[PDB]
A paper describes a structure:
Localized reconstruction of each of the four types of the Gn–Gc capsomers (pentamers and hexamers of type 1–3) resulted in four independent structures at resolutions between 7.7 and 8.6-Å. Imposing lower than six-fold symmetry (two-fold symmetry for the type 2 hexamer and three-fold symmetry for the type 3 hexamer), or no symmetry (type 1 hexamer) gave the highest resolution, suggesting significant deviations from six-fold symmetry in the hexamers. We first performed fitting with the localized reconstruction of the pentamer at 7.7 Å resolution, followed by fitting the resulting Gn–Gc heterodimer model to localized reconstructions of the hexamers at 8.0–8.6 Å resolution. Consistent with previous biochemical and structural studies, this fitting verified that the Gn and Gc assemble as heterodimers, which form higher order ring-like pentameric and hexameric capsomer structures on the mature virion. Domain A of the Gn forms a ring on top of these capsomers interacting with domain II of Gc, occluding a surface area of ~950 Å2. The Gn–Gc interface is formed between the β-ribbon domain of the Gn and the hydrophobic fusion loops of Gc11, which are shielded from solvent at the interface between Gn domains A and B. As the N-linked glycosylation displayed on viruses is unlikely to be obscured in protein–protein interfaces, mapping of putative N-linked glycosylation sites onto pentameric and hexameric Gn–Gc capsomers was performed to validate the model. This analysis revealed all putative N-linked glycosylation sites to be either solvent exposed (RVFV Gn Asn438 and RVFV Gc Asn794, Asn1035) or facing unoccupied density that could partially correspond to an ordered glycan (Gc site Asn1077). Interestingly, the embedding of the fusion loops was only observed in the case of the pentamers and not with the hexamers.
Rift Valley fever virus (RVFV; genus phlebovirus, family Phenuiviridae) is an important example of an enveloped virus that harbours a class II fusion protein. As with other phleboviruses, RVFV displays two glycoproteins on the lipid bilayer envelope of the virion, Gn and Gc, which form higher order pentameric and hexameric ring-shaped assemblies. While the Gc glycoprotein is responsible for membrane fusion, the role of the Gn remains undefined. Virus entry is completed upon Gc-mediated fusion of the viral envelope and host cell membrane, in a pH-dependent mechanism.
Residue numbers in the entry:
A (entry chain H): 742 to 795
B (entry chain D): 796 to 849
C (entry chain C), G (entry chain E): 154 to 287, 290 to 379, 393 to 469
D (entry chain F): 850 to 1011
E (entry chain H): 1012 to 1118
F (entry chain H): 850 to 903
The structure:
C-alpha cells in the first residue's frame, strides 16, 4: 500500500496581471550656455523656433 | 477560371468560381499531410420553357 | 496541371496504320523529336483537358496498349472514289485543324479506332471535312478530340446516353427526327466505359486518387540531368524482381524498402492512376473521357 | 456556427418509372436535377423566426449541441471562440492562418525560469453541458438525419405543394 | 484531476517490525478538515508501516524509521464517539489496535 | 500594474512515492507538469469580480 | 568582442577511423587547410545553432575527448554483404546530402557514434542511403545534425523519452501502441546524457552562464578585424608562461597583461560558457543537443 500525498497549504486568490509598466522619481539637470548675437549660431529666429530633437 | 475547369472556355453565361478547403492525408485520397483543395465551377442554367416580364 | 508533359510512361507510341512516317521521332515519345500528333496536344488555350491530366495514356497509346480496339477500316481513305466511310462522322463534327496535315483521327460510335487518311500529297483545309491539293507537310495525324486513354475494369453497358430533348447529339442518333429540328453549335463532353458506346454527358466531374499499380509511381537513377528508369522492376513485398529501388513513405509503402542495396530513387506521382467520373450518382472509372466540340441537333416539336 | 434562417427542408425520394429510386431534398423554393425533369417546392410550412442570438456546435462524426449565447464577429477574451481558425487541420495542428486575441498568453519571467499559463475556455464543457436534444420553447432541436447541418423537429402538420 | 503519463512505480518488500502505540486524538467529524490522530511507531529499521480498519474504508501509511517517532495523519469520521479498532502491519502481519477520542461538530 | 480577475490559486506540495517533495500551484484550470504526470484544477466556485478599478 | 567561428577549443580534431585521410588539414582545425567535415558547418542559413554556439565542441571532438561512446562498427560499408547494421537506425533519419562527400555520420538512438561509407568509386546521393556513380571524393564525413558537445559527466539514466502523442520514434519502442501509427517526418529536438540513450524532448530551455574559463575568450595576433591567435599559449595570472598577451578588464581579470610587451590583444568571447538544458523541470548538463528531422510515428486510431 503506497500513498500519493498532495499537501494543501491554504486557499489563495492570485491576481491576473495584464498591462504593466515601471515608474519612479527623477530630477532634471539644466545646463546654461549663453552666446552673443551674430556669433556662430546665435540668432533671433533660430532661438524662437528651435527643435528639441536637434 | 482555374486550370481544372479551363477546358470549357470563356462562356457567355452566368457563372462563378469558388474555392473550398478540404482535408487531406491518406484518409481522403492524398499522399501528404498538407490540406488539399476543391475547385468549384458552378454556372447558372434555365430549367423552364418560357419567361416572364415583371 | 501536370509537370510531366513530354515524358510518356510505358510504350508511348503515337502512330496509326497507313501513316507510319513519323516513328523516328514519335516512337517512343520523349522530350526530343517532333511528333505532329502530340505537339498540338500541349498547346496553351487549345486542349486544357489534356494539360490537366497528362500522366495517363492518349488514344493511340491506349490502342497500342491493348485497351481500345480498332474499327473497320481503322484508317479510311478521304480521297477514294465511290464515297468513303469517314464522311458522315466527320461532317457532323465542327473542329478546326491547321494546314499541312493529311490525317485526323477521332472517336467513332463503337468506341474503337476510326481515322482518316490522305494520300500523298494531299493536305486538309481549315475544317478538315475535305482534302485538297498542295511549307512542309506533317508526317502524322491531328487529334480532333481531347480525350486520354486509361485502364479500367468497370462495366457500363447499361449507362446509355440519356440526353433528354436532344434528337441527335455528336455522331450517335437517339431517334429519327421527322418533325422539327434545331441545329446549333454546342459543346458536350463524352465518356466511354467498358463494353459500351460513346456515351455523352452534360456536366463533367473529375476525381483524382492513387493506388498500388506501377503506373502511379515514377523513379530515376543517379548518374554523372534527369534520367528515366523502369519502375516495374521494383520487387514486391516478399516476392521477386529485377533492380532494387527505394523511396519515401509513399513509395516504400507500396514496394519493399531496400535503401542500402537500391540502385535508384523512386518517388510518388503527382496524383495519377485512377480517374473516376460521377455518373448516375455513383463513381465509375471511364476508359477515354474527353471534351470535344461537335454539332448538337436538339428537338423543337 | 450560427443560424440566420430556418429553411423548411423536406427529405423526399423519387421513385422513377423503371424502378430506380433517387433520394433528394427540397428547401423553401429550391430545385434539383433528376433523370426525367426537375422537382421543386411551391409552398413552405411554418417558419421559426429569431435565431441571431443563438449558436450551434457541430462535431465531426458525433452529435450536435446548442449554445444560448449571441455570436460575436470579433475574437475577444472570455467568449466561446477566442482562438478561431478555418479548418480542422488548422486547429489540430494550430496553423498560422487562424486568428486569436492579442495579449492572451500570460508570461512570468523568473531570470532563467519561464512559465506560460493561459486561461483557455474548454469547449467540451459547453458541448457536454448543452447537447442536443434540448427543449426550447414549443419546438425540439435535434440532430440531422441526412445532410450535415442543424435541423429542427416541429409538432405541426405538413402543408406544402410539390 | 491527476493524470498519469506512463510512470513506472517500484516497491521493495519490507520485512521489518514496528509496534505502534496510541497517543491522543483531537479534531472533528463530518467536516472538511477531519481528525488528527497521534501514533507512536517504534521500529528497529527504516521501512513503511501500513494500517487499516475492519471494513477496509480507512488506511494509514506512515514512514517508519529507527527509533521512537510520533507520527499520524488526518482521519475522517461520522460519529463523535470513535471506537473503531485498527490493524497496523509493518511487513504483512497485522496487530490489534484500538483508538478513541471525543470529537466536535464542525463543517 | 493592475488586475483583471482573481485566479483561485492553490499551492500544492506534491509528495512522490519514492519520497521526492515538490511544491507547485494550480489556478483556474491550468496544469503543471511533474515527474509522475500533470495535475490540474477541476471544478471551481470561489471567485471575486471587480478588480479593474484598482 | 565577436568570437570566431573556427577557433575550436580543446584538441580541435575532426576525423574518424576509416575516413581519416583528411588528417593533414583537419588535425588540428585552424585557418590553414580546408577540412571537409567543417566547411558545411559554417554555411549561413543551414546550421544556425552551430553558428550561435561558436566556442563549443562538436560530436567528433566529443568522441576524441572520451565523452561520446563509439559504435561497433563505427564506420560500416554501404555496398557490403550480409546486410548493413548502419541502415535500420539511419533510414528513419530524414536528412539531406549534397555532393562530393562520400561518407556521413549521425548520432544514433544508442548514444554512440555511428557512420557509413561507400567503397570507391561511389559517392552519396540526395539523402546518403546508397552509392552511385558520377567529381572529387572528399575523404571525410558529412555531418547530418546540428548538435554541440561539452565536457560534462552528469549522470542521467533515470530520464527517458516521455513525449505526448508519440507512439514510437526512431528505433526505440516507447509506449505500447495498440492502434495505428502515423508514419511521418517532423522536427523535434533531443538531448543525450551520460550512460543513457538518445532521449527525445518536445521542448527545451537553454541557459548560458559566463565564467572565467580559458575557452571563453579570444585574442587577435599582432606584431611586437585581424587574425586569430592561440589562447593556450597565454600566461596565467600571477605567473608567466610561453608567449605574452594582454587584454581589457574581462581578459585581464583572469590572466595577466604585459601591455607593450604583449603579442595578442585578448578580448571577451560573446558566445561561450556552460550550456545547460532543462528536462522534466530540472536543470541538467547535456552532452549533445541537436535539431534534426526524424520519422515520428504518432497516433491515428
Amino acid at each position: 500500500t503506497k500513498f500519493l500525498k498532495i499537501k494543501t497549504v491554504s486557499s489563495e486568490l492570485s491576481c491576473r496581471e495584464g498591462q504593466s509598466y515601471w515608474t519612479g522619481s527623477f530630477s532634471p539637470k539644466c545646463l546654461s550656455s549663453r552666446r552673443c548675437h551674430l556669433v556662430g549660431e546665435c540668432h533671433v529666429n533660430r532661438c524662437l523656433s528651435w527643435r528639441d530633437n536637434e | 477560371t482555374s486550370a481544372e475547369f479551363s477546358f470549357v472556355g470563356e462562356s457567355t453565361t452566368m457563372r462563378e468560381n469558388k474555392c473550398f478547403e478540404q482535408c487531406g492525408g491518406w484518409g481522403c485520397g492524398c499522399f501528404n499531410v498538407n490540406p488539399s483543395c476543391l475547385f468549384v465551377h458552378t454556372y447558372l442554367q434555365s430549367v423552364r420553357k418560357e419567361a416572364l416580364r415583371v | 496541371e501536370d509537370p510531366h508533359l513530354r515524358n510518356r510512361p510505358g510504350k508511348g507510341h503515337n502512330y496509326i496504320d497507313g501513316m507510319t512516317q513519323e516513328d523516328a521521332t514519335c516512337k517512343p515519345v520523349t522530350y526530343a523529336g517532333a511528333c505532329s500528333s502530340f505537339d498540338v496536344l500541349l498547346e496553351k488555350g487549345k486542349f486544357p483537358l489534356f494539360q490537366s491530366y497528362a500522366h495517363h495514356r492518349t488514344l493511340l497509346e491506349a490502342v497500342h496498349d491493348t485497351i481500345i480496339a480498332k474499327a473497320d477500316p481503322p484508317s479510311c481513305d478521304l480521297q477514294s472514289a465511290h464515297g468513303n466511310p469517314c464522311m458522315k462522322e466527320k461532317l457532323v463534327m465542327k473542329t478546326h485543324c491547321p494546314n499541312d496535315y493529311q490525317s485526323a483521327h477521332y472517336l467513332n460510335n463503337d468506341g474503337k479506332m476510326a481515322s482518316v487518311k490522305c494520300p500523298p500529297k494531299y493536305e486538309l483545309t481549315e475544317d478538315c471535312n475535305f482534302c485538297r491539293q498542295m511549307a512542309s507537310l506533317k508526317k502524322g495525324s491531328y487529334p480532333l478530340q481531347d480525350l486520354f486513354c486509361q485502364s479500367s475494369e468497370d462495366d457500363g453497358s447499361k449507362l446509355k446516353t440519356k440526353m433528354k430533348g436532344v434528337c441527335e447529339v455528336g455522331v450517335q442518333a437517339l431517334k429519327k427526327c421527322d418533325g422539327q429540328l434545331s441545329t446549333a453549335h454546342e459543346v458536350v463532353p463524352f465518356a466511354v466505359f467498358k463494353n459500351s458506346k460513346k456515351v455523352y454527358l452534360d456536366k463533367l466531374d473529375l476525381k483524382t486518387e492513387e493506388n498500388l499499380l506501377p503506373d502511379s509511381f515514377v523513379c530515376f537513377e543517379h548518374k554523372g540531368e534527369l534520367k528515366s528508369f523502369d519502375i516495374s522492376q521494383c520487387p514486391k513485398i516478399g516476392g521477386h524482381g529485377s533492380k532494387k529501388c527505394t523511396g519515401d513513405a509513399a513509395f516504400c509503402s507500396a514496394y519493399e524498402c531496400t535503401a542500402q542495396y537500391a540502385n535508384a530513387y523512386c518517388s510518388h506521382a503527382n496524383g495519377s492512376g485512377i480517374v473516376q467520373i460521377q455518373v448516375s450518382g455513383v463513381w465509375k472509372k471511364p476508359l477515354c473521357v474527353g471534351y470535344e466540340r461537335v454539332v448538337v441537333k436538339r428537338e423543337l416539336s | 456556427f450560427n443560424c440566420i434562417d430556418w429553411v423548411h427542408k423536406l427529405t423526399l425520394e423519387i421513385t422513377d418509372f423503371d424502378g430506380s429510386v433517387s433520394t433528394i431534398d427540397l428547401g423553401a423554393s429550391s430545385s434539383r436535377f433528376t433523370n426525367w425533369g426537375s422537382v421543386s417546392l411551391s409552398l413552405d410550412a411554418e417558419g421559426i423566426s429569431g435565431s441571431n442570438s443563438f449558436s450551434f456546435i457541430e462535431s465531426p462524426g458525433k452529435g450536435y449541441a446548442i449554445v444560448d449565447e449571441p455570436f460575436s464577429e470579433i475574437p475577444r477574451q472570455g467568449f466561446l471562440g477566442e482562438i478561431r481558425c478555418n479548418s480542422e487541420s488548422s486547429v489540430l495542428s494550430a496553423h498560422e492562418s487562424c486568428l486569436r486575441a492579442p495579449n492572451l498568453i500570460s508570461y512570468k519571467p523568473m531570470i532563467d525560469q519561464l512559465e506560460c499559463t493561459t486561461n483557455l475556455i474548454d469547449p467540451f464543457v459547453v458541448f457536454e453541458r448543452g447537447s442536443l436534444p434540448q427543449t426550447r420553447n414549443d419546438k425540439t432541436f435535434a440532430a440531422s438525419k441526412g445532410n450535415r447541418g442543424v435541423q429542427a423537429f416541429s409538432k405541426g402538420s405538413v402543408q406544402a405543394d410539390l | 484531476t491527476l493524470m498519469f503519463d506512463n510512470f513506472e512505480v517500484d516497491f521493495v518488500g519490507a520485512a521489518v517490525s514496528c509496534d505502534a502505540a496510541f497517543l491522543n486524538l483531537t479534531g472533528c467529524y463530518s467536516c472538511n478538515a477531519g481528525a488528527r490522530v497521534c501514533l507512536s511507531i517504534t521500529s528497529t529499521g527504516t521501512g513503511s508501516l501500513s494500517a487499516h480498519n475492519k471494513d477496509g474504508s480507512l488506511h494509514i501509511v506512515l514512514p517508519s524509521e529507527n527509533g521512537t517517532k510520533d507520527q499520524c495523519q488526518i482521519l475522517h469520521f461520522t460519529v463523535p464517539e470513535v471506537e473503531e479498532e485498527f490493524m497496523y502491519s509493518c511487513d504483512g502481519d497485522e496487530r490489534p489496535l484500538l483508538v478513541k477520542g471525543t470529537l466536535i461538530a464542525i463543517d
